[PDB]
Amino acid sequence: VQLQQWGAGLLKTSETLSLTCAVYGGSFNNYNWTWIRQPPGKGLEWIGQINHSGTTNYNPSLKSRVTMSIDPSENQFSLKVRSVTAADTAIYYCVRGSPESSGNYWGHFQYWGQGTLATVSSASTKGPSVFPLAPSSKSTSGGTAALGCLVKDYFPEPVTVSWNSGALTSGVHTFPAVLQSSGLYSLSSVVTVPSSSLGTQTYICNVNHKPSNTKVDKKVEP
Amino acid sequence: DIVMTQSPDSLSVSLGERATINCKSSQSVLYSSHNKNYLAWYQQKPGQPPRLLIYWASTRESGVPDRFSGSGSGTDFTLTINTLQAEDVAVYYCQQYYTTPYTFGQGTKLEIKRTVAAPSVFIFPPSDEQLKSGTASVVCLLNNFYPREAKVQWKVDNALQSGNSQESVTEQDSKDSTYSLSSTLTLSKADYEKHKVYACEVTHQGLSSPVTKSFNRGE
Numbered sequence A: 001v002q003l004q005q006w007g008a009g010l011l012k013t014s015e016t017l018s019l020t021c022a023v024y025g026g027s028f029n030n031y032n033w034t035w036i037r038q039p040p041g042k043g044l045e046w047i048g049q050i051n052h053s054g055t056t057n058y059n060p061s062l063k064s065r066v067t068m069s070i071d072p073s074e075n076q077f078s079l080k081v082r083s084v085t086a087a088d089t090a091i092y093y094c095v096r097g098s099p100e101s102s103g104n105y106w107g108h109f110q111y112w113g114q115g116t117l118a119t120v121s122s123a124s125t126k127g128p129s130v131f132p133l134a135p136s137s138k139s140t141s142g143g144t145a146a147l148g149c150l151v152k153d154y155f156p157e158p159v160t161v162s163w164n165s166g167a168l169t170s171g172v173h174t175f176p177a178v179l180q181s182s183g184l185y186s187l188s189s190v191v192t193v194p195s196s197s198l199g200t201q202t203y204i205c206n207v208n209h210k211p212s213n214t215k216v217d218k219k220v221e222p
Numbered sequence B: 001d002i003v004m005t006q007s008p009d010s011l012s013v014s015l016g017e018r019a020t021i022n023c024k025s026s027q028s029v030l031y032s033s034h035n036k037n038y039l040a041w042y043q044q045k046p047g048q049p050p051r052l053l054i055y056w057a058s059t060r061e062s063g064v065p066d067r068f069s070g071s072g073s074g075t076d077f078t079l080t081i082n083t084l085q086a087e088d089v090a091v092y093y094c095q096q097y098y099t100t101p102y103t104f105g106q107g108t109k110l111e112i113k114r115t116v117a118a119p120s121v122f123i124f125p126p127s128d129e130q131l132k133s134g135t136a137s138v139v140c141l142l143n144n145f146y147p148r149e150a151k152v153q154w155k156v157d158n159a160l161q162s163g164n165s166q167e168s169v170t171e172q173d174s175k176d177s178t179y180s181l182s183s184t185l186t187l188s189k190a191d192y193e194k195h196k197v198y199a200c201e202v203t204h205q206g207l208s209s210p211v212t213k214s215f216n217r218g219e
Ligand SMILES: *[C@@H]1O[C@H](CO)[C@@H](O[C@@H]2O[C@H](CO)[C@@H](O)[C@H](O)[C@H]2NC(C)=O)[C@H](O)[C@H]1NC(C)=O
Pocket: A029, A030, A031, A032, A051, A052, A057, A098, A099, A100, A101, A102, A103, A104, B100
């Protein structure tokens, strides 16, 4: 069972949030297809469910603003949330709910999608500037160097950073973004490496800000 | 609605010891017909969806080791994590699936207590590229320390800085149970070029004395 989801992203107050989830594995028609959301740094709120008969149940917290829809042909189901405010900024997860066979007897949420962030703001999309954090000409007493990339002034979340197209993962720390007073995000991604690697190993940070279509590969050298 | 309340909101438990997280439902979630509690426990790591651990209050999901134990009935439930492992760092949620709307506990954040580990400290001057743009970001990195509590003080030509820095701390590492921290000093190009010595001073329990990393602008 794999759940692939897309949509949400940046939208303005009073606009309509739209998400779609596609189910891989078969047995689409047997289940309540479910949406659950999580505001940043907060808990989980069940939004509602739809089955292949188009039968719904929405949380009264949101019910007046929600429409779910289902396309059994394409093993897809969707969410709309109307008249959004900052209260709707959240990670939205598509989830497999209870089977027809047994309902709440088998009602635990085993299968979750990776989630999609909705950001409710009037602010512009803005791609980051990517600046090298060059390894010092003086390494640690014990022969370790640190280097990184500063990913500065972007909106909205998220960004991804890899090193050497994912070949370098050990000692990587991609910091949680700081929301600056300006309302733009900034983060650093750093890695520690052997001093002895600096002469012969190329270090490149791969930055992707999908919201702005920004994709930057930045070589970091002494 | 059935209100789900967890206790505590956060806890810090040593490697190899026992974590206990309580969950109360405002109404019984015992389906008397089946003698099953419609109560689930989830483990959520940063940037991941929740992972189901337990259904029916005490039945482990596939792939969950028996260190995770669910107990209780009716309104009062407990998740016990025995022989705590580094990879258990997460927020834990209870949830009722007794009746719609389905409702989650507020979450309990579990921190791993490990031995004290001193940070390695690095300072990065602003890039030439950034200076062209009229701003200078100076970065101080504290790498792989425990505990979380750390003091970073910026000094410019020996003057203590206030109001011009921002910190970010990583989530606790799922392998070595450490934190890392960035502190970023943000100046105008003009202010940056007015001063010579840029220093980061770190105070932490694992350090014999506060550690300073510094550079002279243009050296
Ligand atoms: C979707 O969830 C509903 C409940 O919201 C399930 O419907 C129940 O199914 C059980 C088992 O057949 C019945 O005993 C209950 O009477 C039903 N309750 C209601 C209120 O309809 C349903 O099974 C779930 N799955 C699908 C695919 O519909």
